[PDB]
JSON list of C-alpha atoms and ligand atoms in Angstrom, two decimals:
[
{"chain": "G", "resi": 960, "resn": "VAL", "atom": "CA", "xyz": [-12.86, 5.64, -13.47]},
{"chain": "G", "resi": 961, "resn": "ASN", "atom": "CA", "xyz": [-11.07, 5.65, -10.10]},
{"chain": "G", "resi": 962, "resn": "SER", "atom": "CA", "xyz": [-11.35, 3.65, -6.87]},
{"chain": "G", "resi": 963, "resn": "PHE", "atom": "CA", "xyz": [-12.93, 6.34, -4.69]},
{"chain": "G", "resi": 964, "resn": "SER", "atom": "CA", "xyz": [-16.21, 5.03, -3.27]},
{"chain": "G", "resi": 965, "resn": "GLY", "atom": "CA", "xyz": [-19.21, 6.41, -1.38]},
{"chain": "G", "resi": 966, "resn": "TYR", "atom": "CA", "xyz": [-18.67, 10.07, -2.30]},
{"chain": "G", "resi": 967, "resn": "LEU", "atom": "CA", "xyz": [-21.46, 12.54, -2.92]},
{"chain": "G", "resi": 968, "resn": "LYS", "atom": "CA", "xyz": [-20.91, 14.54, -6.13]},
{"chain": "G", "resi": 969, "resn": "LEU", "atom": "CA", "xyz": [-21.13, 18.28, -5.52]},
{"chain": "G", "resi": 970, "resn": "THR", "atom": "CA", "xyz": [-19.98, 19.53, -8.93]},
{"chain": "G", "resi": 971, "resn": "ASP", "atom": "CA", "xyz": [-18.38, 18.30, -12.12]},
{"chain": "G", "resi": 972, "resn": "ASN", "atom": "CA", "xyz": [-15.07, 17.84, -10.29]},
{"chain": "G", "resi": 973, "resn": "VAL", "atom": "CA", "xyz": [-15.65, 17.98, -6.49]},
{"chain": "G", "resi": 974, "resn": "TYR", "atom": "CA", "xyz": [-16.78, 14.99, -4.40]},
{"chain": "G", "resi": 975, "resn": "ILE", "atom": "CA", "xyz": [-17.30, 14.79, -0.62]},
{"chain": "G", "resi": 976, "resn": "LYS", "atom": "CA", "xyz": [-17.56, 12.08, 2.04]},
{"chain": "G", "resi": 977, "resn": "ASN", "atom": "CA", "xyz": [-17.68, 11.71, 5.83]},
{"chain": "G", "resi": 978, "resn": "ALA", "atom": "CA", "xyz": [-14.41, 9.87, 6.34]},
{"chain": "G", "resi": 979, "resn": "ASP", "atom": "CA", "xyz": [-11.13, 9.62, 8.23]},
{"chain": "G", "resi": 980, "resn": "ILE", "atom": "CA", "xyz": [-8.54, 10.73, 5.67]},
{"chain": "G", "resi": 981, "resn": "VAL", "atom": "CA", "xyz": [-5.96, 8.36, 7.18]},
{"chain": "G", "resi": 982, "resn": "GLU", "atom": "CA", "xyz": [-8.22, 5.33, 6.73]},
{"chain": "G", "resi": 983, "resn": "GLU", "atom": "CA", "xyz": [-9.29, 6.54, 3.28]},
{"chain": "G", "resi": 984, "resn": "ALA", "atom": "CA", "xyz": [-5.69, 6.92, 2.11]},
{"chain": "G", "resi": 985, "resn": "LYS", "atom": "CA", "xyz": [-4.76, 3.49, 3.48]},
{"chain": "G", "resi": 986, "resn": "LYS", "atom": "CA", "xyz": [-7.67, 1.97, 1.54]},
{"chain": "G", "resi": 987, "resn": "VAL", "atom": "CA", "xyz": [-7.38, 3.88, -1.75]},
{"chain": "G", "resi": 988, "resn": "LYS", "atom": "CA", "xyz": [-3.61, 4.50, -1.85]},
{"chain": "G", "resi": 989, "resn": "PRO", "atom": "CA", "xyz": [-4.26, 7.57, -4.03]},
{"chain": "G", "resi": 990, "resn": "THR", "atom": "CA", "xyz": [-1.65, 9.19, -6.22]},
{"chain": "G", "resi": 991, "resn": "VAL", "atom": "CA", "xyz": [-1.87, 12.34, -4.08]},
{"chain": "G", "resi": 992, "resn": "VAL", "atom": "CA", "xyz": [-3.03, 12.86, -0.51]},
{"chain": "G", "resi": 993, "resn": "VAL", "atom": "CA", "xyz": [-3.16, 16.48, 0.66]},
{"chain": "G", "resi": 994, "resn": "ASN", "atom": "CA", "xyz": [-1.83, 17.37, 4.10]},
{"chain": "G", "resi": 995, "resn": "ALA", "atom": "CA", "xyz": [-3.12, 20.37, 6.04]},
{"chain": "G", "resi": 996, "resn": "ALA", "atom": "CA", "xyz": [0.41, 21.61, 6.67]},
{"chain": "G", "resi": 997, "resn": "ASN", "atom": "CA", "xyz": [2.00, 24.59, 8.37]},
{"chain": "G", "resi": 998, "resn": "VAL", "atom": "CA", "xyz": [5.00, 26.47, 6.98]},
{"chain": "G", "resi": 999, "resn": "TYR", "atom": "CA", "xyz": [7.42, 24.58, 9.25]},
{"chain": "G", "resi": 1000, "resn": "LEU", "atom": "CA", "xyz": [5.99, 21.18, 8.30]},
{"chain": "G", "resi": 1001, "resn": "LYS", "atom": "CA", "xyz": [5.58, 20.45, 12.01]},
{"chain": "G", "resi": 1002, "resn": "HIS", "atom": "CA", "xyz": [2.88, 17.79, 11.88]},
{"chain": "G", "resi": 1003, "resn": "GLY", "atom": "CA", "xyz": [1.53, 18.02, 15.40]},
{"chain": "G", "resi": 1004, "resn": "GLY", "atom": "CA", "xyz": [-2.25, 17.85, 15.30]},
{"chain": "G", "resi": 1005, "resn": "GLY", "atom": "CA", "xyz": [-5.34, 17.79, 13.16]},
{"chain": "G", "resi": 1006, "resn": "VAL", "atom": "CA", "xyz": [-4.95, 16.09, 9.80]},
{"chain": "G", "resi": 1007, "resn": "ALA", "atom": "CA", "xyz": [-1.17, 16.59, 9.80]},
{"chain": "G", "resi": 1008, "resn": "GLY", "atom": "CA", "xyz": [-0.62, 14.92, 13.16]},
{"chain": "G", "resi": 1009, "resn": "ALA", "atom": "CA", "xyz": [-2.87, 12.04, 12.11]},
{"chain": "G", "resi": 1010, "resn": "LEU", "atom": "CA", "xyz": [-1.20, 11.49, 8.73]},
{"chain": "G", "resi": 1011, "resn": "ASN", "atom": "CA", "xyz": [2.24, 11.66, 10.28]},
{"chain": "G", "resi": 1012, "resn": "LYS", "atom": "CA", "xyz": [1.32, 9.20, 13.05]},
{"chain": "G", "resi": 1013, "resn": "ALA", "atom": "CA", "xyz": [0.09, 6.77, 10.38]},
{"chain": "G", "resi": 1014, "resn": "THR", "atom": "CA", "xyz": [3.56, 6.94, 8.73]},
{"chain": "G", "resi": 1015, "resn": "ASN", "atom": "CA", "xyz": [5.27, 6.04, 12.03]},
{"chain": "G", "resi": 1016, "resn": "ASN", "atom": "CA", "xyz": [6.87, 9.56, 12.01]},
{"chain": "G", "resi": 1017, "resn": "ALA", "atom": "CA", "xyz": [8.56, 9.02, 8.63]},
{"chain": "G", "resi": 1018, "resn": "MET", "atom": "CA", "xyz": [6.64, 12.01, 7.26]},
{"chain": "G", "resi": 1019, "resn": "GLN", "atom": "CA", "xyz": [8.12, 14.20, 10.01]},
{"chain": "G", "resi": 1020, "resn": "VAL", "atom": "CA", "xyz": [11.67, 12.93, 9.42]},
{"chain": "G", "resi": 1021, "resn": "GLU", "atom": "CA", "xyz": [11.40, 13.66, 5.69]},
{"chain": "G", "resi": 1022, "resn": "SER", "atom": "CA", "xyz": [9.82, 17.05, 6.41]},
{"chain": "G", "resi": 1023, "resn": "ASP", "atom": "CA", "xyz": [12.59, 18.09, 8.79]},
{"chain": "G", "resi": 1024, "resn": "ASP", "atom": "CA", "xyz": [15.18, 17.41, 6.09]},
{"chain": "G", "resi": 1025, "resn": "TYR", "atom": "CA", "xyz": [13.07, 19.39, 3.58]},
{"chain": "G", "resi": 1026, "resn": "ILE", "atom": "CA", "xyz": [12.94, 22.42, 5.90]},
{"chain": "G", "resi": 1027, "resn": "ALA", "atom": "CA", "xyz": [16.64, 22.20, 6.76]},
{"chain": "G", "resi": 1028, "resn": "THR", "atom": "CA", "xyz": [17.41, 22.42, 3.03]},
{"chain": "G", "resi": 1029, "resn": "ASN", "atom": "CA", "xyz": [14.73, 24.81, 1.77]},
{"chain": "G", "resi": 1030, "resn": "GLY", "atom": "CA", "xyz": [13.40, 26.82, 4.70]},
{"chain": "G", "resi": 1031, "resn": "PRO", "atom": "CA", "xyz": [9.73, 27.30, 5.53]},
{"chain": "G", "resi": 1032, "resn": "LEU", "atom": "CA", "xyz": [6.90, 27.28, 3.04]},
{"chain": "G", "resi": 1033, "resn": "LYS", "atom": "CA", "xyz": [4.74, 30.33, 2.38]},
{"chain": "G", "resi": 1034, "resn": "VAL", "atom": "CA", "xyz": [1.19, 30.58, 3.69]},
{"chain": "G", "resi": 1035, "resn": "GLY", "atom": "CA", "xyz": [-0.80, 29.65, 0.59]},
{"chain": "G", "resi": 1036, "resn": "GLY", "atom": "CA", "xyz": [2.09, 27.54, -0.72]},
{"chain": "G", "resi": 1037, "resn": "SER", "atom": "CA", "xyz": [2.87, 23.86, -0.99]},
{"chain": "G", "resi": 1038, "resn": "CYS", "atom": "CA", "xyz": [5.49, 21.22, -1.59]},
{"chain": "G", "resi": 1039, "resn": "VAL", "atom": "CA", "xyz": [5.35, 17.66, -2.91]},
{"chain": "G", "resi": 1040, "resn": "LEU", "atom": "CA", "xyz": [6.93, 15.01, -0.68]},
{"chain": "G", "resi": 1041, "resn": "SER", "atom": "CA", "xyz": [6.57, 11.25, -0.33]},
{"chain": "G", "resi": 1042, "resn": "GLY", "atom": "CA", "xyz": [3.21, 9.72, 0.47]},
{"chain": "G", "resi": 1043, "resn": "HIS", "atom": "CA", "xyz": [4.97, 6.99, 2.48]},
{"chain": "G", "resi": 1044, "resn": "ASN", "atom": "CA", "xyz": [2.57, 4.09, 3.18]},
{"chain": "G", "resi": 1045, "resn": "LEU", "atom": "CA", "xyz": [-0.52, 6.25, 2.52]},
{"chain": "G", "resi": 1046, "resn": "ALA", "atom": "CA", "xyz": [-0.22, 7.46, -1.09]},
{"chain": "G", "resi": 1047, "resn": "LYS", "atom": "CA", "xyz": [2.33, 7.86, -3.86]},
{"chain": "G", "resi": 1048, "resn": "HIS", "atom": "CA", "xyz": [2.82, 11.54, -2.99]},
{"chain": "G", "resi": 1049, "resn": "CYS", "atom": "CA", "xyz": [1.80, 13.92, -0.24]},
{"chain": "G", "resi": 1050, "resn": "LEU", "atom": "CA", "xyz": [1.02, 17.49, -1.29]},
{"chain": "G", "resi": 1051, "resn": "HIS", "atom": "CA", "xyz": [1.66, 19.56, 1.84]},
{"chain": "G", "resi": 1052, "resn": "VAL", "atom": "CA", "xyz": [-0.53, 22.67, 1.48]},
{"chain": "G", "resi": 1053, "resn": "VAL", "atom": "CA", "xyz": [-0.50, 25.59, 3.91]},
{"chain": "G", "resi": 1054, "resn": "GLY", "atom": "CA", "xyz": [-3.87, 27.23, 4.33]},
{"chain": "G", "resi": 1055, "resn": "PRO", "atom": "CA", "xyz": [-4.11, 30.34, 6.49]},
{"chain": "G", "resi": 1056, "resn": "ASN", "atom": "CA", "xyz": [-4.48, 29.58, 10.21]},
{"chain": "G", "resi": 1057, "resn": "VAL", "atom": "CA", "xyz": [-7.07, 31.97, 11.65]},
{"chain": "G", "resi": 1058, "resn": "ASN", "atom": "CA", "xyz": [-5.93, 31.10, 15.17]},
{"chain": "G", "resi": 1059, "resn": "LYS", "atom": "CA", "xyz": [-2.61, 32.75, 14.17]},
{"chain": "G", "resi": 1060, "resn": "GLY", "atom": "CA", "xyz": [-4.18, 35.83, 12.56]},
{"chain": "G", "resi": 1061, "resn": "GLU", "atom": "CA", "xyz": [-3.45, 34.88, 8.95]},
{"chain": "G", "resi": 1062, "resn": "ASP", "atom": "CA", "xyz": [-5.32, 36.37, 5.99]},
{"chain": "G", "resi": 1063, "resn": "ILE", "atom": "CA", "xyz": [-8.29, 34.22, 4.93]},
{"chain": "G", "resi": 1064, "resn": "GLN", "atom": "CA", "xyz": [-7.93, 35.53, 1.36]},
{"chain": "G", "resi": 1065, "resn": "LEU", "atom": "CA", "xyz": [-4.87, 33.25, 1.13]},
{"chain": "G", "resi": 1066, "resn": "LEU", "atom": "CA", "xyz": [-7.24, 30.26, 1.18]},
{"chain": "G", "resi": 1067, "resn": "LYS", "atom": "CA", "xyz": [-7.85, 30.63, -2.56]},
{"chain": "G", "resi": 1068, "resn": "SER", "atom": "CA", "xyz": [-4.09, 30.65, -3.21]},
{"chain": "G", "resi": 1069, "resn": "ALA", "atom": "CA", "xyz": [-3.77, 27.50, -1.09]},
{"chain": "G", "resi": 1070, "resn": "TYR", "atom": "CA", "xyz": [-6.43, 25.66, -3.11]},
{"chain": "G", "resi": 1071, "resn": "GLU", "atom": "CA", "xyz": [-4.77, 26.72, -6.40]},
{"chain": "G", "resi": 1072, "resn": "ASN", "atom": "CA", "xyz": [-1.99, 24.24, -5.58]},
{"chain": "G", "resi": 1073, "resn": "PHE", "atom": "CA", "xyz": [-4.49, 21.42, -6.15]},
{"chain": "G", "resi": 1074, "resn": "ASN", "atom": "CA", "xyz": [-4.74, 22.35, -9.86]},
{"chain": "G", "resi": 1075, "resn": "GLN", "atom": "CA", "xyz": [-1.23, 20.97, -10.44]},
{"chain": "G", "resi": 1076, "resn": "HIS", "atom": "CA", "xyz": [-2.56, 17.43, -9.83]},
{"chain": "G", "resi": 1077, "resn": "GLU", "atom": "CA", "xyz": [-5.21, 15.62, -11.86]},
{"chain": "G", "resi": 1078, "resn": "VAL", "atom": "CA", "xyz": [-6.77, 13.77, -8.88]},
{"chain": "G", "resi": 1079, "resn": "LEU", "atom": "CA", "xyz": [-6.38, 14.32, -5.12]},
{"chain": "G", "resi": 1080, "resn": "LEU", "atom": "CA", "xyz": [-7.70, 13.07, -1.79]},
{"chain": "G", "resi": 1081, "resn": "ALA", "atom": "CA", "xyz": [-7.87, 16.09, 0.50]},
{"chain": "G", "resi": 1082, "resn": "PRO", "atom": "CA", "xyz": [-9.28, 17.71, 3.63]},
{"chain": "G", "resi": 1083, "resn": "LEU", "atom": "CA", "xyz": [-10.95, 21.10, 3.67]},
{"chain": "G", "resi": 1084, "resn": "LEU", "atom": "CA", "xyz": [-8.13, 23.62, 3.92]},
{"chain": "G", "resi": 1085, "resn": "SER", "atom": "CA", "xyz": [-8.05, 25.91, 6.97]},
{"chain": "G", "resi": 1086, "resn": "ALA", "atom": "CA", "xyz": [-10.88, 23.94, 8.64]},
{"chain": "G", "resi": 1087, "resn": "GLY", "atom": "CA", "xyz": [-10.65, 22.24, 12.02]},
{"chain": "G", "resi": 1088, "resn": "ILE", "atom": "CA", "xyz": [-7.84, 23.59, 14.18]},
{"chain": "G", "resi": 1089, "resn": "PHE", "atom": "CA", "xyz": [-6.89, 26.17, 11.52]},
{"chain": "G", "resi": 1090, "resn": "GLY", "atom": "CA", "xyz": [-10.00, 28.06, 12.64]},
{"chain": "G", "resi": 1091, "resn": "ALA", "atom": "CA", "xyz": [-11.72, 29.03, 9.37]},
{"chain": "G", "resi": 1092, "resn": "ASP", "atom": "CA", "xyz": [-15.40, 28.49, 8.53]},
{"chain": "G", "resi": 1093, "resn": "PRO", "atom": "CA", "xyz": [-15.65, 25.08, 6.80]},
{"chain": "G", "resi": 1094, "resn": "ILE", "atom": "CA", "xyz": [-18.66, 26.15, 4.72]},
{"chain": "G", "resi": 1095, "resn": "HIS", "atom": "CA", "xyz": [-16.44, 28.91, 3.37]},
{"chain": "G", "resi": 1096, "resn": "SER", "atom": "CA", "xyz": [-13.57, 26.50, 2.76]},
{"chain": "G", "resi": 1097, "resn": "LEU", "atom": "CA", "xyz": [-15.83, 24.20, 0.72]},
{"chain": "G", "resi": 1098, "resn": "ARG", "atom": "CA", "xyz": [-17.09, 27.16, -1.32]},
{"chain": "G", "resi": 1099, "resn": "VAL", "atom": "CA", "xyz": [-13.54, 28.32, -2.08]},
{"chain": "G", "resi": 1100, "resn": "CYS", "atom": "CA", "xyz": [-12.58, 24.76, -3.02]},
{"chain": "G", "resi": 1101, "resn": "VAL", "atom": "CA", "xyz": [-15.45, 24.41, -5.49]},
{"chain": "G", "resi": 1102, "resn": "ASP", "atom": "CA", "xyz": [-14.77, 27.85, -7.00]},
{"chain": "G", "resi": 1103, "resn": "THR", "atom": "CA", "xyz": [-10.97, 27.35, -7.27]},
{"chain": "G", "resi": 1104, "resn": "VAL", "atom": "CA", "xyz": [-10.09, 23.70, -7.88]},
{"chain": "G", "resi": 1105, "resn": "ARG", "atom": "CA", "xyz": [-10.64, 22.51, -11.45]},
{"chain": "G", "resi": 1106, "resn": "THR", "atom": "CA", "xyz": [-9.00, 19.09, -11.09]},
{"chain": "G", "resi": 1107, "resn": "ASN", "atom": "CA", "xyz": [-10.76, 16.10, -9.51]},
{"chain": "G", "resi": 1108, "resn": "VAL", "atom": "CA", "xyz": [-10.84, 16.45, -5.72]},
{"chain": "G", "resi": 1109, "resn": "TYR", "atom": "CA", "xyz": [-12.21, 13.91, -3.24]},
{"chain": "G", "resi": 1110, "resn": "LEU", "atom": "CA", "xyz": [-12.83, 15.65, 0.09]},
{"chain": "G", "resi": 1111, "resn": "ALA", "atom": "CA", "xyz": [-12.75, 13.68, 3.34]},
{"chain": "G", "resi": 1112, "resn": "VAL", "atom": "CA", "xyz": [-14.65, 15.35, 6.18]},
{"chain": "G", "resi": 1113, "resn": "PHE", "atom": "CA", "xyz": [-13.62, 13.81, 9.51]},
{"chain": "G", "resi": 1114, "resn": "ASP", "atom": "CA", "xyz": [-16.52, 15.12, 11.62]},
{"chain": "G", "resi": 1115, "resn": "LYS", "atom": "CA", "xyz": [-19.80, 13.37, 10.82]},
{"chain": "G", "resi": 1116, "resn": "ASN", "atom": "CA", "xyz": [-21.93, 16.21, 12.18]},
{"chain": "G", "resi": 1117, "resn": "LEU", "atom": "CA", "xyz": [-20.20, 19.10, 9.83]},
{"chain": "G", "resi": 1118, "resn": "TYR", "atom": "CA", "xyz": [-20.35, 16.65, 6.94]},
{"chain": "G", "resi": 1119, "resn": "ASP", "atom": "CA", "xyz": [-24.15, 16.73, 7.20]},
{"chain": "G", "resi": 1120, "resn": "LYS", "atom": "CA", "xyz": [-24.04, 20.50, 7.69]},
{"chain": "G", "resi": 1121, "resn": "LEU", "atom": "CA", "xyz": [-21.85, 21.00, 4.60]},
{"chain": "G", "resi": 1122, "resn": "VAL", "atom": "CA", "xyz": [-24.08, 18.92, 2.31]},
{"chain": "G", "resi": 1123, "resn": "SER", "atom": "CA", "xyz": [-27.36, 20.43, 3.48]},
{"chain": "G", "resi": 1124, "resn": "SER", "atom": "CA", "xyz": [-25.96, 23.96, 3.18]},
{"chain": "G", "resi": 1125, "resn": "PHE", "atom": "CA", "xyz": [-24.19, 23.43, -0.14]},
{"chain": "G", "resi": 1126, "resn": "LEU", "atom": "CA", "xyz": [-25.34, 25.76, -2.89]},
{"chain": "Q", "resi": 1734, "resn": "LIG", "atom": "O1", "xyz": [-9.13, 20.11, 7.63]},
{"chain": "Q", "resi": 1734, "resn": "LIG", "atom": "C1", "xyz": [-9.72, 20.22, 8.91]},
{"chain": "Q", "resi": 1734, "resn": "LIG", "atom": "C2", "xyz": [-10.58, 18.91, 9.22]},
{"chain": "Q", "resi": 1734, "resn": "LIG", "atom": "N1", "xyz": [-9.69, 17.81, 9.63]},
{"chain": "Q", "resi": 1734, "resn": "LIG", "atom": "C3", "xyz": [-9.68, 16.47, 9.18]},
{"chain": "Q", "resi": 1734, "resn": "LIG", "atom": "N2", "xyz": [-10.37, 16.15, 8.04]},
{"chain": "Q", "resi": 1734, "resn": "LIG", "atom": "C4", "xyz": [-10.38, 14.85, 7.57]},
{"chain": "Q", "resi": 1734, "resn": "LIG", "atom": "N3", "xyz": [-9.76, 13.79, 8.12]},
{"chain": "Q", "resi": 1734, "resn": "LIG", "atom": "C5", "xyz": [-9.07, 14.11, 9.25]},
{"chain": "Q", "resi": 1734, "resn": "LIG", "atom": "N4", "xyz": [-8.36, 13.24, 10.00]},
{"chain": "Q", "resi": 1734, "resn": "LIG", "atom": "C6", "xyz": [-7.78, 13.85, 11.08]},
{"chain": "Q", "resi": 1734, "resn": "LIG", "atom": "C7", "xyz": [-8.13, 15.20, 11.03]},
{"chain": "Q", "resi": 1734, "resn": "LIG", "atom": "C8", "xyz": [-8.97, 15.42, 9.87]},
{"chain": "Q", "resi": 1734, "resn": "LIG", "atom": "C9", "xyz": [-11.70, 19.24, 10.26]},
{"chain": "Q", "resi": 1734, "resn": "LIG", "atom": "C10", "xyz": [-11.79, 18.77, 11.56]},
{"chain": "Q", "resi": 1734, "resn": "LIG", "atom": "C11", "xyz": [-12.97, 19.33, 12.17]},
{"chain": "Q", "resi": 1734, "resn": "LIG", "atom": "C12", "xyz": [-13.54, 20.12, 11.20]},
{"chain": "Q", "resi": 1734, "resn": "LIG", "atom": "O2", "xyz": [-12.78, 20.07, 10.04]},
{"chain": "Q", "resi": 1735, "resn": "CL", "atom": "CL1", "xyz": [-8.30, 19.64, 12.25]}
]
């Protein structure tokens, strides 16, 4: 039993809700919130900009130190950093950004990072401003993640499209 509420159950391990991931994290305080990161951990827009804003820029300050020490992430890769006021941990995961010409096949690799955590609150990787098809992202999620994932989503109209189209 966990404290996630109002989710539709898609499979044994994947749940989905129309929700603002910032507000969801602030309510649930999950062990892990997933950020839709880029390799530079520059949290400018989309989910990343919103999560960082909610931390009063502390996420960005921590991220800049991480990059200065370690260099950029790989597309498809991840790192675990603080969850600040939103969660215990933030798993920063880099899905391919189609608006940069990155290989959509890397989306499966990106979702594999979720399997290192028993339970996660997450967005659909590579959706929104990363330019991939969200129906595809949900399919890859369901076919790749084996741990318990709670997907938030932001856009009420896509949420309805994702449910009604879900196979
Ligand atoms: O992963 C992309 C996804 N973005 C978010 N999902 C959940 N909560 C959010 N809060 C702020 C942004 C955001 C999206 C946007 C439009 C279509 O898909
Ligand atoms: Cl987005």
